[PDB]
Amino acid sequence: XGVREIAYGLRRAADDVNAQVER
Amino acid sequence: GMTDCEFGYIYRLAQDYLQCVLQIPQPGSGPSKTSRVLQNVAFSVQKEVEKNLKSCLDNVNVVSVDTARTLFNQVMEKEFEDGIINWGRIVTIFAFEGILIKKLLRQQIAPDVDTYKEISYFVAEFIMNNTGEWIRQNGGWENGFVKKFEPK
User: Fold this and answer.
1) Could you tell me if B89 and A15 are in contact, meaning their C-beta atoms sit under 8 angstroms apart?
2) Which of A15, B28, B29, B114 is most buried, by CB atoms within 10 Å?
3) How far is it, in rounded angstroms, from Cα A20 to Cα A6?
4) Is B92 within 8 Å of chain A by CB?
């Protein structure tokens, strides 16, 4: 599934992407 | 520059990415360096999200632009409700509009060739109104996003 799983799944993928260029 | 947070620039980025996903890139000079960097990073995220959330996404039906807009707004609201903004989250906005346009292509009841122009419009609406201030304060697209995500 639903809005929640999608949105917080997106959030998790984002904060990972972000952290992996945050040097 | 500092003006790249204006609506027209963001709209072009969002439209460029949907044209990439739909494999209808416009001819001429080609996309800007910002768009070129963004398309690679956003598509990487899109593929991973499509794989990890296949069950939830396969369960969704994006049958109209209005349903796409309402779902986009509902999902973005929850993703950003904690008040945190960063470049990774901005990338997932583009990735999600790519997911939406792909589902619309298959599921839109009354398909229309200007659909991706409408999707990119309300995507730019959200980016400018909810993250534009942060983007400006962090160097914009040229001095912020491209500097962090371009090849080393």
Assistant:
1) yes
2) A15
3) 21
4) yes
Q: How many domains, in total, are found in chain B?
A: 1
Query: What is the rounded distance in angstroms from the CA atom of residue B47 to the CA atom of residue B148?
Result: 21
Neighbours of B152 (CB within 10 A): 4
What does DSSP assign to residue A23? Answer: -
DSSP 8-state assignment for residue B29:
S
Residue type, B124: A
Task: Please state whether B140 falls in left (phi above 0), alpha (psi between -120 and 50) or beta.
Answer: left
Q: Which residue has the tokens 């360096």?
A: B33
CATH at residue B50: 1.10.437.10
Residues of B in contact with A23 (CB under 8 A): none
Task: Quickly list DSSP for A2-19.
Answer: -HHHHHHHHHHHHHHHHH
Q: In terms of residue numbers, what domain contains B103?
A: 1-152
CB contact under 8 A, B56 and A9: yes
Query: With contact defined as beta carbons under 8 Å apart, do B9 and B3 qualify?
Result: yes
Partner residue facing B91 (CB), from A3, A9, A17: A17
